[PDB]
Every structure is written in structure tokens, then in C-alpha cells.
Amino acid sequence: AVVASLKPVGFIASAIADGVTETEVLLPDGASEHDYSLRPSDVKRLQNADLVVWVGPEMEAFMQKPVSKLPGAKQVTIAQLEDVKPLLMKGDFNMHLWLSPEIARATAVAIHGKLVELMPQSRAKLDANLKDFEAQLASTETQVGNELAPLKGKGYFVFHDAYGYFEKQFGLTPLGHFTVNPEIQPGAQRLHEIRTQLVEQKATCVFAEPQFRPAVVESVARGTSVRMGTLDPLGTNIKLGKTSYSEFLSQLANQYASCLKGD
Ligand SMILES: [Zn+2]
Ligand SMILES: [Zn+2]
């Protein structure tokens, strides 16, 4: 099996590995990429994996040590891909790379290349999977593009700084984020800054996330006319499979649009 660190990385892997091998995801639904420890049984899972796919050391702290034990031939470190480095946006870069369709393409190519070397017998199927992934993703980019276009100019805050690659591609205009690190709670001042910005900049929405209780987001919005939505950067509701990455980006767009559309 291909073992992916995070569900959306698994979505990409499952598009390429479909009908070739299984895909498994380490980080459970509901858990956060920023605050996690591997299960004791995960050591053996990573050792037995055909391929391990992850973003990198500045993202999944929990992956670095086990990954270092593996052959280079058996891992894809997305953030370190030569085609990915020039696409990194800010000496710190944002590491939520799975929400970049272009980085998803680079990842798919990387996975395709490692799996064709490990399993030359599967070359035809892997080739077709790569071509189908591209076709699906292109269609989704068009659809998402058209869904999000009318939402340009509607301001909003998100809970943590996870969406930059997606927002940049699709032209959304966020006012900002509650936190960078979603475990660390926002200060009373920051919450007031957001509440002030919210009223002054006439924001449409604030977004919670399923991984964290929305109380603090609800409090910034108490008494205001700002709507409340939820974004899921980790695709908890989407199941792994050939079309999962497309379904994920479509759902995320749907989550923005559900709150932002109108009034
Ligand atoms: Zn994050
Ligand atoms: Zn910030």
C-alpha cells in the first residue's frame, strides 16, 4: 500500500494508485496536522509501505523520524520536490500544499514516477491513472473557478492559515485568519482586532473548522451581522478513491459558497 500522512495527500495518492495498490492514511479524521503522534502500530505500517507520501518536516512533525529510516526510493516528500520549491508561497513558507492544484499535480507526477519504478508491471495502469487525474482535476478547476468567481470581493476570516494556495488560485479575498497555529488560542486583543476589522471592513463570513470547537469564532461574531460557516482543510467527509481529490476541492468550494453567496 501507499501510506499518506494526511487525508488529502491520500486523495492524490489514491487517484494514481487506483487498481494498482491500496492507499492508507495515517492522520485520523478529526485530528490536526499540527498536533499529532503516530500510533505505536504505525511504525510497522510505514516499514511495510510500498511508498510513503507526506508534505515534509515543516508540516507533519510526527513523520520525520520514521520517514528518515526508509529508502529514498520509497518516499515522496512534497515540499522538497524540485518542481514544488518555486511554487511555495510565504524565511518561512506556507506548507498546506495539498490545497494547491499545481502542487497536487507535481505530487501526482512524483507518485507516478516512484510507483512505475517500484512496479514496472503496472506502468500502463499508472499512466492512465495520471491522465485521468489530470482530466478530473482540470474539470474541477473549471467548475470551482466558476462557483467562486462571483464571491470575489466578499471579505471573511478563517480559523487557521491553511487555505492560501486555494484562495490565490480561485481569486477569493480573505481578510485574514484567527491563528497560524490552531492549537494556540488567539489573544483577547487579536480577537478584538478581528471583531473591529469584521465590522469596519464589512465582512460577510467567519469560518470555523471541524477539528476545533467553534466557540472562540462564535464569540468574535457575537452581536454582529457576520455569518458563520465551516471549512474543512482535511476532507473528513470525503472517502479515499479515484475521484476523491476532485470531490475534496469541490466540497471546499461548496463550503466557501454556502456562507459567502449573497446577500
Ligand atoms: Zn494547518
Ligand atoms: Zn498571520
Side-chain angles (χ1 to χ4, degrees):
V2 174
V3 174
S5 57
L6 311 177
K7 217 181 190 181
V9 174
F11 298 158
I12 298 163
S14 66
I16 307 302
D18 192 59
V20 173
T21 192
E22 289 79 20
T23 301
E24 300 183 58
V25 168
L26 296 171
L27 183 73
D29 290 338
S32 178
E33 67 274 20
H34 299 290
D35 186 31
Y36 187 65
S37 301
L38 288 179
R39 290 172 295 239
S41 69
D42 289 334
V43 204
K44 182 180 158 187
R45 285 210 176 76
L46 287 165
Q47 279 166 184
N48 288 133
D50 292 309
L51 181 67
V52 177
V53 188
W54 71 310
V55 169
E58 285 179 62
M59 176 43 65
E60 311 97 322
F62 58 88
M63 291 295 295
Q64 178 160 209
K65 287 185 189 155
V67 165
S68 73
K69 301 177 203 152
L70 300 183
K74 296 205 158 175
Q75 68 200 62
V76 170
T77 313
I78 300 163
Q80 291 170 187
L81 289 170
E82 291 301 306
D83 286 349
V84 169
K85 293 186 204 166
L87 312 178
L88 299 171
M89 60 191 47
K90 318 201 92 190
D92 252 359
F93 308 93
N94 192 294
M95 285 288 146
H96 295 80
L97 307 189
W98 59 93
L99 278 173
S100 170
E102 289 288 286
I103 299 173
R105 290 182 163 95
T107 299
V109 166
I111 293 174
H112 168 85
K114 294 273 184 183
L115 288 181
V116 161
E117 294 297 291
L118 293 159
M119 303 169 183
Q121 66 267 28
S122 299
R123 191 182 303 255
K125 184 75 183 186
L126 292 163
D127 281 358
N129 283 350
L130 187 64
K131 174 165 179 177
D132 290 357
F133 176 73
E134 173 64 42
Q136 293 184 55
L137 182 53
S139 308
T140 300
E141 283 175 311
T142 301
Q143 292 160 197
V144 169
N146 290 324
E147 182 171 9
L148 298 179
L151 311 180
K152 182 97 195 160
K154 306 193 161 174
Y156 64 87
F157 279 82
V158 302
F159 181 62
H160 95 281
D161 191 13
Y163 309 92
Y165 289 91
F166 184 89
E167 292 166 331
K168 179 81 187 304
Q169 185 167 337
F170 296 113
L172 298 171
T173 61
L175 306 164
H177 45 265
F178 282 72
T179 59
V180 168
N181 205 350
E183 287 80 40
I184 293 155
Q185 275 294 101
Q189 55 141 347
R190 179 57 196 159
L191 284 159
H192 184 71
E193 293 171 24
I194 295 161
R195 182 180 178 85
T196 307
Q197 284 176 74
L198 219 57
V199 176
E200 265 151 29
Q201 293 177 291
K202 297 175 185 67
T204 306
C205 286
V206 287
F207 292 98
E209 289 169 3
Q211 291 80 18
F212 300 95
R213 315 289 45 91
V216 81
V217 175
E218 287 158 350
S219 72
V220 97
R222 282 182 307 194
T224 62
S225 61
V226 169
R227 300 202 285 283
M228 290 174 293
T230 298
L231 300 173
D232 187 0
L234 291 172
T236 63
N237 286 319
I238 303 93
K239 307 301 140 210
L240 284 171
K242 194 180 167 66
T243 61
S244 61
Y245 188 70
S246 280
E247 286 164 9
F248 166 63
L249 297 187
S250 295
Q251 176 180 281
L252 183 63
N254 280 347
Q255 296 175 329
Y256 278 106
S258 170
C259 190
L260 289 169
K261 194 178 175 298
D263 39 331

